[PDB]
Structure formats: structure tokens, C-alpha cells
Amino acid sequence: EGREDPQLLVRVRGGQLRGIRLKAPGGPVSAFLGIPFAEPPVGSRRFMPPEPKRPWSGVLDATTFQNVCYQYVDTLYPGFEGTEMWNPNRELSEDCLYLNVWTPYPRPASPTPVLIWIYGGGFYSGAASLDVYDGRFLAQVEGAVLVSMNYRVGTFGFLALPGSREAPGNVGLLDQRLALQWVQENIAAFGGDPMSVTLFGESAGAASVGMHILSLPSRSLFHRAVLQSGTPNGPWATVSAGEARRRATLLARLVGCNDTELIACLRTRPAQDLVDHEWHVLPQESIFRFSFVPVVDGDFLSDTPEALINTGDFQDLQVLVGVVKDEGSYFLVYGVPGFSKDNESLISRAQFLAGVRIGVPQASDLAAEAVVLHYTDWLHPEDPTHLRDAMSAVVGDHNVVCPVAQLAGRLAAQGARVYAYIFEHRASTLTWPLWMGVPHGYEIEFIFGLPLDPSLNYTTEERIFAQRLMKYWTNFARTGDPNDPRDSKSPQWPPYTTAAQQYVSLNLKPLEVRRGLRAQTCAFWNRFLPKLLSA
Amino acid sequence: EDPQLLVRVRGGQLRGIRLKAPGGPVSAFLGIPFAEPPVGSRRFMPPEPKRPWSGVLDATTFQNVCYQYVDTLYPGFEGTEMWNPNRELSEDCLYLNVWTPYPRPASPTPVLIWIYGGGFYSGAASLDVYDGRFLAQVEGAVLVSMNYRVGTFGFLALPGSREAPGNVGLLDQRLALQWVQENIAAFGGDPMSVTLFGESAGAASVGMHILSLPSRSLFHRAVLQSGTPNGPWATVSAGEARRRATLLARLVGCNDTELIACLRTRPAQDLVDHEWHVLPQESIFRFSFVPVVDGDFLSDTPEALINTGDFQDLQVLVGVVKDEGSYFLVYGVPGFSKDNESLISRAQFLAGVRIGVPQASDLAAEAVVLHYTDWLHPEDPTHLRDAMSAVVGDHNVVCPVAQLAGRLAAQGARVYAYIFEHRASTLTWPLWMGVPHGYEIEFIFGLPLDPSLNYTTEERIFAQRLMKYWTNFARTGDPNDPRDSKSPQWPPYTTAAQQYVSLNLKPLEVRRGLRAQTCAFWNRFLPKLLSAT
Ligand SMILES: O/N=C/c1cccc[n+]1CCCCCCC[n+]1ccccc1/C=N/O
Numbered sequence A: 001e002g003r004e005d006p007q008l009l010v011r012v013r014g015g016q017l018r019g020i021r022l023k024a025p026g027g028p029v030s031a032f033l034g035i036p037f038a039e040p041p042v043g044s045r046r047f048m049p050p051e052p053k054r055p056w057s058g059v060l061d062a063t064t065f066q067n068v069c070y071q072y073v074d075t076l077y078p079g080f081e082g083t084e085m086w087n088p089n090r091e092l093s094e095d096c097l098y099l100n101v102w103t104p105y106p107r108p109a110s111p112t113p114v115l116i117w118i119y120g121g122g123f124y125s126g127a128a129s130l131d132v133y134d135g136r137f138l139a140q141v142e143g144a145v146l147v148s149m150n151y152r153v154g155t156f157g158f159l160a161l162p163g164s165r166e167a168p169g170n171v172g173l174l175d176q177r178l179a180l181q182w183v184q185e186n187i188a189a190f191g192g193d194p195m196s197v198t199l200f201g202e203s204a205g206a207a208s209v210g211m212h213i214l215s216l217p218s219r220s221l222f223h224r225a226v227l228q229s230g231t232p233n234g235p236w237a238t239v240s241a242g243e244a245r246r247r248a249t250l251l252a253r254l255v256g257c258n259d260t261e262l263i264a265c266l267r268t269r270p271a272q273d274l275v276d277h278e279w280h281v282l283p284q285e286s287i288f289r290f291s292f293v294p295v296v297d298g299d300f301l302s303d304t305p306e307a308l309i310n311t312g313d314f315q316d317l318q319v320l321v322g323v324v325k326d327e328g329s330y331f332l333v334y335g336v337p338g339f340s341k342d343n344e345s346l347i348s349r350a351q352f353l354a355g356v357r358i359g360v361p362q363a364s365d366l367a368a369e370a371v372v373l374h375y376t377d378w379l380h381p382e383d384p385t386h387l388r389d390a391m392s393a394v395v396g397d398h399n400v401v402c403p404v405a406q407l408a409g410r411l412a413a414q415g416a417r418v419y420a421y422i423f424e425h426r427a428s429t430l431t432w433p434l435w436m437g438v439p440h441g442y443e444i445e446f447i448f449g450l451p452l453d454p455s456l457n458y459t460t461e462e463r464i465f466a467q468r469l470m471k472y473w474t475n476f477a478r479t480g481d482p483n484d485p486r487d488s489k490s491p492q493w494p495p496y497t498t499a500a501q502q503y504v505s506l507n508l509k510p511l512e513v514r515r516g517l518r519a520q521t522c523a524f525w526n527r528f529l530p531k532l533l534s535a
Numbered sequence B: 001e002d003p004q005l006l007v008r009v010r011g012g013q014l015r016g017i018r019l020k021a022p023g024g025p026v027s028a029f030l031g032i033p034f035a036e037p038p039v040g041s042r043r044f045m046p047p048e049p050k051r052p053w054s055g056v057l058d059a060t061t062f063q064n065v066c067y068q069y070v071d072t073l074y075p076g077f078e079g080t081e082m083w084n085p086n087r088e089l090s091e092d093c094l095y096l097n098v099w100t101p102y103p104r105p106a107s108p109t110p111v112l113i114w115i116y117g118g119g120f121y122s123g124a125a126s127l128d129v130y131d132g133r134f135l136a137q138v139e140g141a142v143l144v145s146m147n148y149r150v151g152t153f154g155f156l157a158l159p160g161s162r163e164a165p166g167n168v169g170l171l172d173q174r175l176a177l178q179w180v181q182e183n184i185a186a187f188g189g190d191p192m193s194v195t196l197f198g199e200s201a202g203a204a205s206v207g208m209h210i211l212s213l214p215s216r217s218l219f220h221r222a223v224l225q226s227g228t229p230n231g232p233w234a235t236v237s238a239g240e241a242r243r244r245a246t247l248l249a250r251l252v253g254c255n256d257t258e259l260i261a262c263l264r265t266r267p268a269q270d271l272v273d274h275e276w277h278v279l280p281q282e283s284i285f286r287f288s289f290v291p292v293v294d295g296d297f298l299s300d301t302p303e304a305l306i307n308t309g310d311f312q313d314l315q316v317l318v319g320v321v322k323d324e325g326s327y328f329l330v331y332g333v334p335g336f337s338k339d340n341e342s343l344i345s346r347a348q349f350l351a352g353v354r355i356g357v358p359q360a361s362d363l364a365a366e367a368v369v370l371h372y373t374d375w376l377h378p379e380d381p382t383h384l385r386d387a388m389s390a391v392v393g394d395h396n397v398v399c400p401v402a403q404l405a406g407r408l409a410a411q412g413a414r415v416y417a418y419i420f421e422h423r424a425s426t427l428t429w430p431l432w433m434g435v436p437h438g439y440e441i442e443f444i445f446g447l448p449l450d451p452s453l454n455y456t457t458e459e460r461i462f463a464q465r466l467m468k469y470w471t472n473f474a475r476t477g478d479p480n481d482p483r484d485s486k487s488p489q490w491p492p493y494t495t496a497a498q499q500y501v502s503l504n505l506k507p508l509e510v511r512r513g514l515r516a517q518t519c520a521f522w523n524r525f526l527p528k529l530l531s532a533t
């Protein structure tokens, strides 16, 4: 300190941080990257709730992204942008409990609404340091304070021997909560308003966000929530205590390991070993199932997310939820026979029926037939293009769209201001094939305003659209309302209500209000399927 | 005496009556006996062929209507009464009516044999909507309709018994068919071109004939309007017929022989008095005495027969009306009435589904409910009402038809399907029932050509089109006009394309998929849901 840039020095509760002046298209932003918010969850601290980071001495360099939490690294399509863009971009380490803060540069005069991003990655992957989560644009363009944190994923985050001390489960959520606690404490040092914290997150991040909505100790830590393509309810975002126990003990078996003995043994297992084996504990051949996810421990989650959304009072909550046009497509290439990124993935009826089983792994034969019969276009039951798309839809609807519809409804029904969107714009830069439509996760780069970066080769329409979305997200963070309070000429985004079930199309075209989030089909999944499973 | 009105049939001479149809005379021979009156000991028995008679049998007026329940829900309401018996009720009713052109056809003219509906509990070939003169006059069709026994008299089965083997109303029909085969030539009818057509229970009956081998030699083409031998109401199992017959018999104070013998001692109205009361559940579109799967007339269930049948040289015209289900709702589904708009509650809808799909488990019913709810307007009465209509119409007609169509198409039949979407301007039922069950018949029969009936000009032209389809179909097995070029063409229904046409005032529109998604629910899913309780 002396010749350092004065705007980049900030003190948080744990000590002094030197951030970095990042170049955003419209000008500088302040980034404090790699701020530790927890004690490294290593050694005996593996599977343990995060312990808050102990203060450090001197100026913690916060100029680079810290380690990515240990995770399975997708090698399905090696060096393909569409996969690699989601892969860890820093070293894998269990010492990964860091968070990142972008703020305008200079730091906002007045306390600025804070956006906390919680990445997705199925609870087994992700990193706040991914290019698509770059907060610089929101910071620069929207003046937003954007916080993203690493949280433990995979076994490290979610292995649970529920009821135990040494592996209570949901610790990755606890990381997240800790990072939320951090923002509450420290964000004002960046000119973030701790009294205006909006969680947003996509997929597992969305699920994690929803789980903070649903978990009391989290509720005082944020004020608004965006759930993108993910919900805490649904068939993948959680597992029962029983099932978590089952998976944790199985994983233990797989790697060579009463609860203490078993965790202690897992704790001696090298990180990579856990990762190499985590996939191998899933109960069925499945897609959109992840081995180590939030567990309904009766603690973080006092009950199933279903029970909590169906009964919780969400009076004081503004939630923005939504989906991409093709939530299922992405998943199909990871295990549904017949699907590939490299061809049209036109499938047979057989491959559809088979895919339905994999995509709805919990489905009894009856349920699977129901699904199939529902998604078959009986006018062309054999049309492979339809079958391919129905397969996408099955997976998408079941895991995201219908969980989301359910969430939007349950929330709306119980006091939330809910805004619902479907995001229908295929990035011009998508490397996933056309058939995959707008896959799960490809709205993120737009919410984050990556298209503002002219080096990134988006169309100017996409630049404008990204700007629109950032406006929505940040208006929402600011006010609880995505609508521009000044730009009345623009079409309006009405809240989603149980009566009207209004949601907007997010595309290049101006906002189109649509009714009923895939209402017929979601009645199938949210109302009928349960009953079919339960008999 | 008018020589054109004198016909020697097998059993003797008949005097018909020259009737006036708007375009000129038709010879009508009404009330021709084709069976021994199925009276006394012959109650519940297969019809025996009518003994020859001396002299000239007066066939100038309709004979009695088979003994049947008379609908009295809306007394003196054109909408209900038009289906009520218009001749004396009698067990002695086994008579058929032939309309022919006047003068009678120079050459063997295709025959249309109409088999009325009435849920197998009612009907009469003598109803005004079955007036064959128009088809006779305009299309030069020889049209035949028979009374067949309904209700207990036609379908009270004690399966495996000698004295009530069941399906006798269908045998009555078969006998009328045989009669046509043996006699229609005398009227100018071509026994080598006999098209059965029927609507609803009639259509199911026609279906039965398709599905029953002895019947197969008595017709070449079939038209099933709003009814099918398959589906939830057209048939009962043997065990169920037995249970209902023995229930009825219990209800009227009655070993098969003795049970039937006692039933035979019972005034007709005593049987009809208790007819309704033997249905297993609070039903609509379910009838107590229907064709039974006896392993005889029906060697298996219609399902099995349509699934496995050979229909290579069969032509079948099948269709439905826009609102197959509305009509039935007024008859037991709470919240529904012809007088108010029948805007029902959700509760009333759930309750109506248990009544509309009486065979449904809770889960099955929930599945129906979840399927037919507009989740966008879930509590909307207009929607719930219309969905109720739809539930009933689809379960009972549309999806059975779609399935019949598909199984026949697949099994090598030539199939033309339609949906009839034009509401008679003269319909007395409320608008919300749209195009109810049976209100195409008047058009097919050409009643709008009767300018006294006050149909619109458009409807006269339309009835003309429909008579052309039906008789063209009768003539050729193809409802398309081999004279007309672009009309456009009514394509065969096939399992692949599932093409059917809208019969309405607009020209034919070819559509694909007869409620395909919904019928998959009904025909493919719902059964699995019962096949697992
Ligand atoms: O062979 N599987 C190995 C394994 C091991 C341990 C955990 C998970 N797996 C599979 C991954 C499945 C889901 C693949 C999803 C990859 N993905 C990454 C970023 C953004 C989206 C997606 C998928 N969207 O469908």
C-alpha cells in the first residue's frame, strides 16, 4: 500500500483485500476475486459445515479467481467449447471456499443492490470463476454489486450421513449460506447494500437459491431470489436422508470405507478418489440425477422442498423464476442412447421409451408409459424428430419446467411476487447443435451480459437483448420488479399468479406475455405423476 | 291398386304406400314382418323367421315400436320426444321398413339398412329422423330399417341358457339383414350391395355385425355413426349380463329356465320398470341390456375381435358428431340441464367424471380429470362443462370410434371417418350441447330436403351432400362423388395419416387425428391404469 490503486483496497471482516481493476466494455469495474469466506474445508473439515474464514494478516490478494471446488470434470466432448465452458477454470482443490465481488469502479457512492450468483452444475460441479459468471458487466453496466461464491459440490459439498456430526449434509449449501453471511457483513465495504441482496442461480444454483428461500437461517441473508432453470423441489434437487445415507455409505464402500469411522475413512480418501466414484452411486441409469445433492436433513431443509413450498408463507418474497426453451436437450447427450452433439439425434420409438426410463429414472413402468403416452405425438408416434424433441421435453419438463411451474405456483399461491419467464433465445454463438434449441444454462451469458463484450462475437441484437436482461435481473434485484420503472413504453412483465399464470418470453423480440407455464403437461408431472407413483 | 306398390316377398304379398318426398314419389313398404312376434315364450328368444301369410299384407304404416323405456325427462320437448316411440309399444315389433324409388329401381339398387340407436334400450325404425323417403327419392336408394328388440327384450341374456341366450336384438337385426338378402331384390334392392348404417347403439350394432361372422354375408359395407361395438357401453361380459339379468329377475320377483320362464310371465312394462335399476354404478352412457359377449354372436369381446379381425374387403364409414358427450350429461350428471347453460363447478366436474366414466378407479378418474382440466382455466365453468361433455363423448364414442377406425384400417378395412360439426338450425337442445349425439341423422336421412321442416337452404344443400356421401359410400364403398372432381376428396382413414373429414356446411376439410392425443389417453393409457387398478 502506497503505489496501489486506492479503489482496489477494501477491508472486510477477515482483513484487507486488494482487488483488481477489470476492463469491461463500458469501462473499469472493481473485482475482488478469491476472497476466502471460509476456513478451507480440508482434512478433518471435509464434509463439515464451513467454519467462517479466520482473519488474515496483511493484504489478501483478491485479483485472481481462487480454486474451484473439487469436482468431476466433464470430458464427454474434449475441448468442445459447449462443455469446456462449464469446466473448472482454476485448480481443483477442496480449499475452494472463496467468493468474488464485482462492483462499479470506482465503488458505488451509495449502497448498491447486491446480486449473489450461485452457480449450477448439478451440485457436483461449477465454479463462480467461469467465464459465463463474469460479474464485470452487471457491475459496469448495471452498477450492480455482484457476488459469487464457490461452494463445495459433489461429495465434498453434499455427502451426508444424515444425523451425524461429521457429515451432516448440505454443507455446500452451508458454504453458500456462509458466503451470504459474508455479504451481509462485508458487502457494504464494497458499497453493496446488505439490505438488498438478491440471490440468483441457475440449475443447481437456482435449486440452491430456492433452498435458501426454504431454509430459515438463510432467509435473513437475502431479500429476493432469482431461480433460473432450477428449483429446490423437483426430482433431482434433493434426496431423502435415507437415500443420502444410502449414497454416502455406498460411495464409502466404493472407495474402501458407525458414522464417524466411515467419514473418517472418507476423509482419508483423496479428493479425486471421491470424485472418480461419486457418479457410481446413482440408484438408476439416469440423466439429470446427481449423486450428492442437498439432503432433506430436517435441519437445513426442515422438510421436503415440496412440503416447504406447498405450506411455507412467502409473503415477503419476490422471486423471479424461469426456464430456457429447451431444458432437456443438454441432458440427453449425457447418457440417453441415440443422442449426440454431433448429429441430429433423431431417435426411434424404442430409444424414446428407453430414454424416458433414463430420464425419469424413478418412474415405474406405468409412470413411464404415462410419460411416453403423454409425450407421443399420436399423429406421428414414430417420427424421430418429434421423438427426439419429446425426449428433450420429457427431461426438461420433468426436471425443470414443471418443478419451476410448481414452484412459481406454490410461491404465488402463498404470497410471493413471482415473475416467470421462458428464455427462448439461442445464443448465436452456441456450439451445441441446433437441435438442442436453447439448452439449460445458455441464458446465463445473457443475464451476465457477456454479449456486451465485443470480442465475444455476439450479434448487436444479442448485445441489446443482454442489456435488456441485465436490466430485468437488476431491476428485480433493486426493486423486486424486473420491469423498468422508467421505460413504461416497453412491454410489461406481469407477475406470475396462480390465476393468470403469466410469464414472459425472453427473446430478441420485445417481451411477450404468455399464460400458463406448460400448464397441461405440468399438471401431468406435478399432479398426476405423483399419484401414479403412489399406487 | 298401384302395381308399383305390390311386392311379392318370400313370405307373401305386401302392399306398400306411395309416399311423397319433395322431389317426387317413393314407394314405402312399412311394417313388414320379418320375424314371428317375439312374444310369450319367444320373449328373449332368437327371432324365428316370419311365417308366410295369405293375401296382401298391408305394409303402408309403421308397425309397433319394440317395447322400451320411454324417455320422459323433458315431457313434450321436441329434443327428447323426437326419439320417443312414435308408434304403439309392443313386444310384437319385429318389422322392417323398405323405402324404394317410385317407380321401383330398373336395376339392382344399393341397399342401405339403417339400424337405429337408443342405447339398446330404445329406438324404432319409425322415427321421423329415420324417414327413408329422401334417400329413397333423391339418391334412388332402397332403404331398409328394422325394428329390433331393445332393453330386456333384446338383450336380457342368461349366457349359455337356451331360453335367453342374449343378443337377440342383434339377431333380430341379423334376421332383418337375411330378410333383405332374401327379399330386397323384389323391391329393386341389390342384395349384393348392402350397406348397414346405424348411429350410436345402431352403430355399435352395425359394428357387431361386422364382428359377427353369420352377419358378414348379409352386408358389404358399414357405417357406424357415433357408436362402435368396442368401447365401454356397447357390450357387457357374459358374467355381467348374467348378473344384470338375474338382478332384473330378482327386481321383478323371479336355474335359468325357471328364472327366464318367470321373466316371460312379466308384463313388458314390469321389465322396463326395472331395466335402469340393474346398472352397477351411477352412470350415464351406460345401458342395462346390451349385446353380451356370448362367445357366439360375438366370439370374443369387440376389443379382441377388432384387434384380430380380418377386414380386407370391408368398407367402413365411421364418424362422430362434434359434441358426442353433451346429450348424455342432462341425464344424470348433476349440474347439467337443457335449460340453463350448465356451467358446472369443479366439484361437479369431478363428480361428473365418476358418473361419466363409471368404470373408473379414483386414479383413473383423477387421470381423466387431470387430462380434461384446462389447467389454465381450471375452475372455469364453460371449460369444465365442455370438458365434461368431452370426457363423456370421447370415452364413449370418439375414442372407441378412433380405435375402431384404427383397428379396421390396420386390419385391412377401407375406412372413411368424419366428424360431423354442423348443429341443426332447428335443434331444440341448448347451444352448449353443440352438435349432440344423433343430430346428424336427420341430415344423412335428408330431412332438410323437406322444406316444411324449416332447415336453412345451406342445410338442404348439406343434407344433399351427406346423402351423397352415404349413398356413394353405399354404392361403391367410397363416399366420394366419382362424378365430382375437386370437392375436395374425402381420404380414407388410415392408421398412418388418420385422415378424416369435417362434415359441416363448409366444404369437406381433411383433418388428421381423431382426438389423437386424448384417445391415446383413453385407448392406450386408461386401460393400463385399470390393468393395474
Ligand atoms: O459419466 N458421468 C460422469 C459423472 C461423474 C460425476 C458426476 C456426474 N457425471 C456425469 C455428468 C452428468 C450431467 C452432465 C451435465 C454437464 N453440464 C455441464 C454444464 C452445464 C450443463 C451441463 C448439462 N446440461 O444438461
Ligand SMILES: O/N=C/c1cccc[n+]1CCCCCCC[n+]1ccccc1/C=N/O
Residues within 6 Å of the ligand: B069, B071, B083, B117, B118, B121, B272, B275, B276, B326, B327, B328, B329, B331, B437, B438
Ligand atoms: O332416467 N332413465 C331411465 C332409464 C330407464 C330404463 C333404461 C334407461 N334409462 C335411462 C335413459 C336415459 C338416456 C336417454 C338418452 C336419450 N336419447 C335418445 C335417443 C338418442 C340419443 C339419446 C341421448 N343421447 O345422449
Ligand SMILES: *[C@@H]1O[C@H](CO)[C@@H](O)[C@H](O)[C@H]1NC(C)=O
Residues within 6 Å of the ligand: A455, A456, A457
Ligand atoms: C470472433 O471473430 C473475430 C473477428 O472476426 C475473430 O478474430 C475471432 O477469432 C473470433 N473469436 C471468438 C471469441 O469467437
